Design a protein around this nucleic acid. Structure first.
Ligand code: NA
Lengths: 219, 219
DNA sequence: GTAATAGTGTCTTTAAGACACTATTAC
DNA sequence: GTAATAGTGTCTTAAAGACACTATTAC
């Protein structure tokens, strides 16, 4: 081993992306903010994914609905002690699902993505986060994967705004709706949610939203 | 460490993909065919990529023009001797650039992709290879990355046929030519290659072919 | 009624598919 | 001339952009 498994976990709340951060309880950089993650445990971990799920669960108490391997970083500069390797994942979950737990804890917090990009973070985690969010931004163009950051069920303009924040620009609502109906990835619950407008349909994500990719990108 | 760094290295020759295999010089499964790869050497390797390149160069004497990290596999099943982690890459290079040297050698061979899918390979390298070509097949739909498997310069129908083999079906020549023209990724050498037909333009790949993605997928 | 937010109709625009038509070589 | 392979012109199709329109709530 000597290897590490980290995760960049995103969610959406307050019309913004937040990212889960954990304050190191060990040297070096004890008390610096970093990504959740840690060493492999061969007694309970049977795959790398099992590890990153365990590290997340140990902080949020829930297994997130979406988890993709992002990349692995390894070199002799990211850590002053020498050669270090991290297998990094990207994940999405809903904010309510775990806000309650992380709040009664001080070494764990949802941070506003936008802020984070200004905080000094452990090792190369800032870069990893940027990489994660870039890849996420890509998925905004050709999947409905961002949906996994919402609570279920959700309205279509909720989903849309999440995409909009990721692309940093508005999206033709009509285009979005067309794509959604076509891709046949949402389950209409028949319920509605009203918030200062016409009541909007509430939908749940079909599982294969994770694997489904659009043939054309948005712009 | 204890980690390993492998590569699925493809090329194209005789209207088919071949993949570089290396016969294990060590136990276990000594003499079984597997991917080129190996341990990290902290004296001379400074990033993971430097490792994989060194492992490839040690067998081909050529640094491949395209290399992207595929994924990292780690669990307790793929190796009977317990927990095992491989960081695996996908690479492309041209066949002639390398054939000469590797024929001089016996524990190294270009294999026809189509065949490899039948012979037994070390550990989980079969799956890795399939992931590799699956993703390569994806790139055929929305990049010109397959080009890196050809020798420079090459004709557009040469490039096209490579895509066609990856997609396992024929492609509309006009569509391809439009896409290529629009993406402004080829350099016309003003040279021509005549082979049983009208002479065809010879082209070189602009470096940024590696990162360029089309807005719409082919079908 | 109005303000607000959800959702549609429909036209224009983009880029791919289909495929017949031309071009340039060896013979 | 024919056969072969490279490359075009152009109509049709699929799916996004733009944007005016209707719908359904709270007040
Ligand atoms: Na990866």
């Amino acid at each position: 081993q000597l290897l590490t498994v980290d995760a960049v976990l995103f969610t959406y709340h307050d019309q913004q992306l937040k990212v889960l951060l954990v304050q190191r309880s060990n040297h070096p950089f004890l008390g610096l903010w970093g990504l959740p993650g840690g060493f492999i445990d061969e007694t309970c971990d049977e795959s790398l994914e099992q590890t990153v799920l365990r590290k997340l669960a140990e902080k949020t108490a829930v297994v997130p609905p979406y988890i993709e391997q992002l990349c692995t970083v390894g070199n002799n500069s990211r850590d002053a002690r020498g050669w270090s390797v991290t297998v990094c994942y990207t994940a999405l979950m809903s904010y309510q699902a775990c806000q309650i737990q992380i709040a009664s804890v001080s070494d764990v917090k949802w941070w506003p993505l936008a802020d984070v990009l200004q905080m000094p973070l452990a090792f190369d985690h800032l870069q990893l986060i940027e990489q994660a969010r870039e890849r996420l931004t890509q998925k905004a163009l050709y999947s409905l994967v961002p949906g996994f950051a919402l609570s279920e069920p959700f309205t279509l303009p909720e989903l849309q705004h999440v995409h909009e924040v990721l692309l940093g620009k508005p999206i033709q609502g009509k285009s979005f709706r067309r794509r959604v109906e076509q891709a046949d990835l949402l389950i209409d619950t028949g319920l509605k949610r009203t918030e200062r407008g016409r009541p909007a349909n509430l939908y749940c994500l079909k599982p294969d939203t994770a694997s489904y990719r659009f043939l054309r990108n948005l712009e």
